[PDB]
Symmetry: none
Subunit: 338 residues, 6 copies
């Protein structure tokens, strides 16, 4: 341990994508990345990404030939998420994350599909997960930063803000090595991980207003900074949505915008505490008109073993509760807001 | 040289005006002022300003008749900024800035144009530039603070925050006599002034996306805490804006609001570091609508000789990079703001 | 009879709620109320309304202990509407309605459900119906005002305006004791009530364009100032909507906004006259785009005996036709506009 | 004392300017003027106003050279309002106000600032305040009308309507010598002036929702027909706005438009009655959008001694309460407008 | 052939109607008309159009009695389009089209249905089709203009612009007698007509991204300047929409607005070339929100023999490709843009 | 009389300002100027303009001290337009307009009001009116060009384009000594000037839809290239706007944006031709929203004797009709622009 922290300011795109800058190379090539506790690899698109993929013409590409600290590896890799898949090869270089500099093995991505990566405002991903789930067992970036012995504590924290058209306010902030009390209130309460290797905790029930109608007898909750939404299994979400009176439009679940504020609180029972989102927290009140339909920030996602079936607590949850991921103690701390 | 630093808390109005409070006279008459490295005089509006100047109706007015420590001078002065002019006369009184008290000659302004000053939340200006550029050869406030030999270093530093809808967020901060490590990370990187007497450095190139398409044979950068935006020559900005796909209007440049988030990076090559802004840093993202127009915090400003032609790096730039102004070593230092 | 009238200016919320001020107590506690010909009791929320109900934390509460004219009664009551139900107890106090002061028994409401009363911009309800339908046979407020012998005529009238974003114009007006010719044109034509005790008239047919396709052989029409919409039985409305080419979205019936103006007039045959709404009168033209769906201000409502089955002519109808409720003659007068 | 009352019809521009017509000279030159209880001088723009004052280009100009009943005076005068200043010189001529003809000294204004006067639909001002506050000790118009002994009572009354998109709606009305019972209901309630010479009364408290949180040890209220809004001291309004959740901008305070309708009541305790405004009365509701900002008709205005510190009750207040100004008994009467 | 061209500037209404001015009569009565290669008759509404039809009260009517060049014919005619039907009688008069004057037989229309002609922003139609499909074998207007021998070439061209809220730019342009290179780039490539008498060409396939999944083994394509959209048979469009992942909302096919840019190019194989529309060309991106649904500018239309079954390439196609209809050579030329 | 024509390319700013470049002095100092048939003097802003005139800070300033061909005069002058006034003094220098060089007396302007000139993209004005209306009897530029006997005809012509978002579109064009057949079609139609000395013709009537409801006994039309709009007397425009259903605001008239496209034609009867504008020609269609307000390019302007009362036909009109100004025959010719 040392005496420093490093923060990275995040851009909020439409409350569904949150990303910040890293630099790769000497001199640094700068990319927009999602900092993702739900995966463990660092990747960006390659200058060798063939321009067949519209996604690669529309994102910043890493040119290894322009860095005097680049070292070749070549080993191939396929990274696949629950919503999309990328593929490429391993390279080594220096990565700057809020003026921490760290030598890191990462993926230069050469196959990058339009679905979904044309919708991505970010270029790549910095996996904040554990080595146990890293592809190619490449040492994750946070472990390499812990190895430097500069960070005040072996934790990192996430603030995700609510988007506003009347402010140019920060979209979010990640702090490596600690937390920022400006963005939460009170004190952390922690829930221990079921096992090291995944940012996943036991959940003891999910209530809709007055009744634990879901997850009686327990279920799993991934805390996923790379997911836009709160997610459940298709069956859990069907039942949640019936309880709310929301219905599947064509693609998504909606409520009449005026009735949004009549919807019940949703509480997630974690570590003896109730983490409660109100309807204002989980419905996109694009308006409050009785003539308009409004979407909810909750979706089905059937996550396969070994990680799933599980709920995923993504940006929707994180906007409400500032989150501290504690590697030393294998636990996740939450605090409100702000 | 002593052992003092004073900080002044600043208010951020709409990401365009940053100002703090000074007290003039006995008893103190308080004023909201911009601390401005692009000018070297102090002024506030005067009680002798005709109320046919509506700007004077809408601001705090120094009344000499209520100050027991006032000393008459009466010498005429006119101050010219690129967006407007003020005129009045010189007076001397005691000024408090962050618990430092200094006897100072300042302008009492009696002619204060509606455009731009009806649009100012601030009342006046504290010039932080050098005596060389002082109108009427009046000794600047920072030279007079140095002469007291209380300050630890002959330096001052600026932190400009992003806008907030929260009361708790600090709008910004000036430190007299040092820098605040709580608002920057990594290390300072320093560029020497072309010449003492102006806060202007050499700029080695401006790149927009993946091309050094501007300032290719070097140019000038004024580091200007009193400017809201980044500015360049009309021809430089025309070229810059062609590359962004932006439309020129009367006073600004706009893009379609849906286009904003995906506009390219802009980098400024200063003293052997690239200083990169993303679109989130220079677009006022107020909507994601394809039907609406979103302003960029970059504009044309043709500054004349001897200082210009020059780029000016204002609040758009300083928000991302904590800035230290070093009078001892005639240099400017940048570090990543937090 | 006397020589006075009393008017109360109404706020229009989104063309679906219309409410104005009454004061209760000495000194007066002011509430927002809907003036409702479809019920006969006065009620407001109580200071004794337990804060379990989010609705009670979000509405103004009557504190009996702060009125020197309050007299206890205690008798309990349940008031239930077609869309929601309230419950509480009877109290007596002085109620001011446009500077008429009247001693009135009313309900202090202690049970107030979030569905629908969290959507209510009004606090309570002033029932303008007859004693025959009053709960607890509490003398309705208008009968108590008639008893004073101050009103020029034993009638009351309603103006409901169309909402506009470009005006701060009156939302509506109720006149006790007469009418306001500024808000209608021409002369009233009256339809007699089927029976005293309910504001309900015989309807002789409903035509969609050129054909009385509905209510041949007669049907009932409640004139209901407490209802947002024109309503029919589920079967009547299914057939009306098929005739218009409107369809059930998920929650509501919609048309493409561009096709709104192609929809046929709807005429209600009352008292030998045709009361005609055009499509502009019954469709919420939130836009006129061929890319957008627009909702209609007509809904199904199966009203149970003894009052139903019946149509209900609520705000949608009243916006078109200024309405005079004539207690002396047991009839309802209509006139256009304006 | 005689048997005449004259009414003047007023135009309502956007709920912010209320003005009627006077005729000056022989033949009459007509002017749109605000009748203003917060000032005691009459002025109109002069033909001698330089056309470099754009405000003079855009208004009606009195030309002395076309009036056979003009009498020269020529004494300089300056008039200062809280939002701007006019300057010119004194002239005498015949003025007709509602079919009363009076010989009157008025200001011919030759200096008329673009801000605020380019934004005025009106040309000039008829001061209805007392001689005590008259600049240059000029006898006010109402004192000269009283001296004719034609008026029934030494009183005048104001009715300010809500805005309308209809041509038929009367914008407002001033009655000279009485009040119009057609535009108020219930009874007048009277408060005595602190002192003759100013239309200022004692205010006993200002409450926001269910709490007397302002003016708790009493304060001052100017009843100001020439002001658009209700105003308080900066500190009073900061506190008021904190309680409403409103954001301060340059010239106004805003809330999110969806929040407007549910903002609390504001009450003004005047002479043993509470005068209550709902949010519909003080919010310019232009939209119900969560993304838009809606202005409040309440602002900060620090009026200096001897008149201030004071609240000012302008058109926001007068729209709800018909106001009678009684010079005989040095009092102000309020009744509920209709 | 002569040496002139005639252009007519078109108004773009919502990207779905395009119309320009013609004058009929001496002196000219001016009408808004769609210039329609998909029909061959000229018609406008008649002054003799009974006002039963709301469409006729809402459009400009031709009064024969006010023209000194009107000559009676009387022969009746019914014109029916794929979306609506009109009926009336033949008249002769002088028609001015961009200052070409031509004696023309046209239909005075006396039966004009609200569906769809109440939605029409245009008054009438100028059929640019061949005599073979003219009703009453009335010589089409372009043949009568060719007969004058004034036009530089026996062709006419169409430019249709994309609508913009930030410009008052031209909606479109038709050029009789040639083309305007300001509105296309590069050189025409032509496809020959299957047969003279219809503006219809052979199509050799329609691909969605990478695969000719439609129209393998050939199909027909009408080039129809009177159609808003690209259309196919119901079966072709069902399959196209499944391939895109679009679905039938209630009335129309939609995609989530954010996913619009992920949709594949659509290429129409005509004359050995691929005419490619991107998703930006065929989806109405009224927004790009993940919370909103967006409609496509492609619809089913089962066109009956002898002309159909066929695709129709209407405004959606024409916006992308500037179109030259070449009567001399019986072919259609296309060029991009602009 | 010689054989030269010169064209000057104009820039279209927002359909409201049309201007081209002139060069003054040796070496040339370039200025953006409106070519204005409604005035007869040339002026540009002067370097002697006080920078307390913010308009002068924001425009190009003629500096006599940098011109070797300058000749002093110094005579004061003031120029009055209907929307503002400029003042300064006379100077002589060489002016180039489209490759014609002429020695010219012009105004150096030292007083330049913020309103309207802060809103001008142009710097100054080239008066194209007659010597009769020249302030200070200064010979107008076109009289001095004629005296060189280089021009083919004693005429000049104006083309004003519609606005564009394209760079390639020419904003407009003035031809000195002829007309450009590339920008008009059909034949010119000529009206003789009421009198030489003003570009004013007789107008025989103004019709709105199907009724000559204005200028029924004849009136005056100034053909004014320096005016943005069509203007009439206040009373004429009130009547015109009543017929359009438009609302009057401070500086303009608006309709609901959805109403814009269906507003009636307006025709101007000039010399035995009707000149017809559709709503597309005089509405700034920025939206089709029922909630938004759309400005008309028609306004009230009361021009005084001897020139007025008069209508003025500005850019709204000239955009549709190519205009030739014939000094040889004292007439104005119109043809349909293309």
């Amino acid at each position: 341990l040392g005496n420093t922290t490093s923060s990275v300011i995040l851009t909020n795109y439409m409350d569904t994508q949150y990303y910040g800058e890293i630099g790769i190379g000497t001199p640094p090539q700068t990319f927009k990345v999602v900092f993702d506790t739900g995966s463990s690899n660092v990747w960006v698109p390659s200058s060798k990404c063939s321009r067949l993929y519209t996604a690669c013409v529309y994102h910043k590409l890493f040119d290894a030939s322009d860095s005097s600290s680049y070292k070749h590896n070549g080993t191939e890799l396929t990274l696949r998420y629950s919503t999309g898949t990328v593929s490429g090869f391993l390279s080594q270089d220096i990565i700057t994350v809020g003026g921490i500099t760290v030598t890191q093995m990462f993926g230069e991505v050469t196959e990058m599909p339009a679905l979904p990566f044309m919708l991505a405002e970010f270029d790549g991903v910095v996996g904040m997960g554990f080595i146990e789930q890293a592809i190619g067992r490449v040492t994750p970036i946070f472990d390499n930063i812990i190895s430097q012995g500069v960070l005040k504590e072996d934790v990192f924290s996430f603030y995700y803000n609510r988007d506003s058209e009347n402010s140019q306010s920060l979209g979010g902030q990640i702090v490596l090595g600690g937390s920022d009390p400006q963005h939460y209130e009170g004190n952390f309460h922690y829930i221990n991980l079921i096992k090291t290797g995944v940012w996943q905790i036991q959940m003891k029930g999910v209530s809709v207003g007055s009744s634990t109608l879901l997850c009686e007898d327990g279920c799993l909750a991934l805390v996923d900074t790379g997911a836009s939404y709160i997610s459940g299994s298709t069956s859990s979400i069907e039942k949640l949505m019936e309880a709310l009176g929301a219905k599947k439009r064509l693609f998504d679940y909606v409520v009449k915008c005026n009735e949004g504020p009549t919807l019940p609180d949703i509480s997630f029972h974690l570590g003896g505490k109730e983490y409660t989102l109100t309807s204002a927290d989980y419905v996109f009140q694009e308006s409050y008109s009785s003539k308009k339909l409004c979407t909810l920030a909750i979706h089905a996602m059937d996550i396969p073993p070994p990680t799933g079936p599980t709920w995923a607590l993504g940006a929707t949850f994180i906007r409400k509760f500032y989150t501290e991921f504690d590697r030393r103690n294998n636990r996740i701390g939450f605090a409100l807001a702000r």
